[PDB]
Amino acid sequence: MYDYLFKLVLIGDSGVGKSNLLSRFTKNEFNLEEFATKTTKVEGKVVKAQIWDTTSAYYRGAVGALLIYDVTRHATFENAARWLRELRGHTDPNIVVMLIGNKCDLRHLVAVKTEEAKAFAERESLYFMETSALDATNVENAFTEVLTQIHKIVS
Ligand SMILES: Nc1nc2c(ncn2[C@@H]2O[C@H](COP(=O)(O)OP(=O)(O)O)[C@@H](O)[C@H]2O)c(=O)[nH]1
Ligand SMILES: [Mg+2]
């Protein structure tokens, strides 16, 4: 069956691409108009990720999280702070967190610049990569580095 059942959660404001980050990783499908499962071999061991996407029951058990904002809407990145506050009051301290700037294929509507976000993420000690669920930029290995950082910690 599997070796680990890693629970991940997805948080972000309305319409930053959470649902499509989930369907792009789990199903390779992107919808131009809740918990998903994938199983992958992280460092030999089979891992079955249960990936939640929108309250105690939401967070509890989560070994990992992806804080997602929308590159073209600066207000959704400002709210990464209130989100990080809610996350940390509900999960184990040593949860793997990755700041995610999605819709990075809208290169000319970027309202949140990378070094801005790389600065906040290093202050709050997060991992960070910009993604596109539309054309699958960095979707896969983002999830596989969250799940690989978690496997690092549990051994
Ligand atoms: N350009 C672009 N648009 C995206 C991307 N991901 C999601 N969207 C758009 O965001 C809208 C809804 O995103 P959704 O995943 O439902 O938002 P959620 O509420 O955060 O889950 C859809 O019309 C998508 O076209 C992306 O990677 N690139
Ligand atoms: Mg959603």
Going from the Cα of 36 to the center of ligand 2, the distance in angstroms, rounded, reads 12
Instruction: Please name the helix (run of DSSP H) or strand (run of DSSP E) that holds residue 102, with its range, or none.
Output: strand 96-102
Provide the residues around ligand 2 (an ion) whose CB is within 5 A. Answer: 18-19
**What is the domain range of residue 45?**
1-155
Among all bound ligands, the one having the nearest atom to the CA of 52 is 2
Q: How was this structure determined?
A: X-ray
Instruction: Please name the helix (run of DSSP H) or strand (run of DSSP E) that holds residue 23, with its range, or none.
Output: helix 18-27
Written as six digits, the tokens of 62 are: 């989560």
Q: Which one of 9, 14, 16, 20 would you pick to mutate in the ligand 1 pocket, going by the greatest count of ligand atoms within 8 A of its CB?
A: 20
Question: Which CATH number do you get for residue 48?
Answer: 3.40.50.300
Q: What resolution in angstroms does the PDB record give?
A: 2.8
Alpha helices in 29-79 (DSSP H): 56-59, 74-78
Name the phi and psi angles at 31, rounded to 5: -100, 115
Q: Which residues line ligand 1 (CB under 6 A)?
A: 12, 14-20, 32, 102-103, 105-106, 132-134
Q: Could you tell me which residues come within 8 angstroms of residue 124 by beta carbon, excluding any fewer than 6 positions away? A: 84
What DSSP letter does each residue of 14-81 carry, written as one string?
Answer: TTSSHHHHHHHHHHS------EEEEEEEETTEEEEEEEEE--HHHHTT-SEEEEEEETT-HHHHHTHH
CA distance 39 to 144: 11
Domain total for the chain?
1
Going from the Cα of 8 to the center of ligand 2, the distance in angstroms, rounded, reads 14
